[PDB]
Write an enzyme that holds these catalytic residues in place. Structure first.
Site, PDB file in Angstrom:
ATOM      1  N   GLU A  71       0.847  -1.186   0.000  1.00  0.00           N
ATOM      2  CA  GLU A  71       0.000   0.000   0.000  1.00  0.00           C
ATOM      3  C   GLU A  71       0.886   1.240   0.000  1.00  0.00           C
ATOM      4  O   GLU A  71       2.059   1.078   0.371  1.00  0.00           O
ATOM      5  CB  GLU A  71      -0.836   0.108   1.287  1.00  0.00           C
ATOM      6  CG  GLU A  71       0.031  -0.138   2.530  1.00  0.00           C
ATOM      7  CD  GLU A  71      -0.809   0.144   3.769  1.00  0.00           C
ATOM      8  OE1 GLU A  71      -1.392   1.251   3.888  1.00  0.00           O
ATOM      9  OE2 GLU A  71      -0.909  -0.776   4.620  1.00  0.00           O
ATOM     10  N   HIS A 100     -10.359   4.133   3.851  1.00  0.00           N
ATOM     11  CA  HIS A 100      -9.702   3.274   4.825  1.00  0.00           C
ATOM     12  C   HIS A 100      -9.873   1.760   4.669  1.00  0.00           C
ATOM     13  O   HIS A 100     -10.180   0.992   5.599  1.00  0.00           O
ATOM     14  CB  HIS A 100     -10.163   3.705   6.256  1.00  0.00           C
ATOM     15  CG  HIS A 100      -9.042   4.582   6.796  1.00  0.00           C
ATOM     16  ND1 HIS A 100      -8.967   5.957   6.966  1.00  0.00           N
ATOM     17  CD2 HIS A 100      -7.843   4.051   7.201  1.00  0.00           C
ATOM     18  CE1 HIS A 100      -7.771   6.284   7.432  1.00  0.00           C
ATOM     19  NE2 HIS A 100      -7.105   5.125   7.567  1.00  0.00           N
TER      20      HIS A 100
END
Length: 108
Positions: A71, A100
């Site tokens: 990520e 998120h």
């Protein structure tokens, strides 16, 4: 810096690495980053959190034998981290999340 969805997407697919303004969470910590105080911009000017392995525990992203996900923080400038992430695989699939890691959408 390069910290937009398109700029980092295109840079990875090409150089197969994140641009120079990214640091892993453990490197940021070592420099003095404390998540609770949102001081990343003070201890690591012009840097963003990126390159850590993302578990994909919940299987929300496509799995494959030997595939691993990483990520990177997108659109960060200063303060506390935001909710925008670029998820990239070892075979260069690029997904984005703006909530998120709740939901994902393909971008490359």
């Amino acid at each position: 810096v390069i910290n937009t969805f398109d700029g980092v997407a295109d840079y990875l697919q090409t150089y197969h690495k994140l641009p120079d303004n990214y640091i892993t969470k453990s490197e940021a910590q070592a420099l003095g980053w404390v998540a609770s105080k949102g001081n990343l911009a003070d201890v690591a000017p012009g840097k963003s959190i990126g390159g850590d392995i993302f578990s994909n525990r919940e299987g929300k992203l496509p799995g494959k034998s030997g595939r691993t996900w990483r990520e990177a923080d997108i659109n960060y400038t200063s303060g506390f981290r935001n909710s925008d992430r670029a998820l990239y695989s070892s075979d260069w699939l690029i997904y984005k999340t703006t909530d998120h890691y709740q939901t994902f959408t393909k971008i490359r």
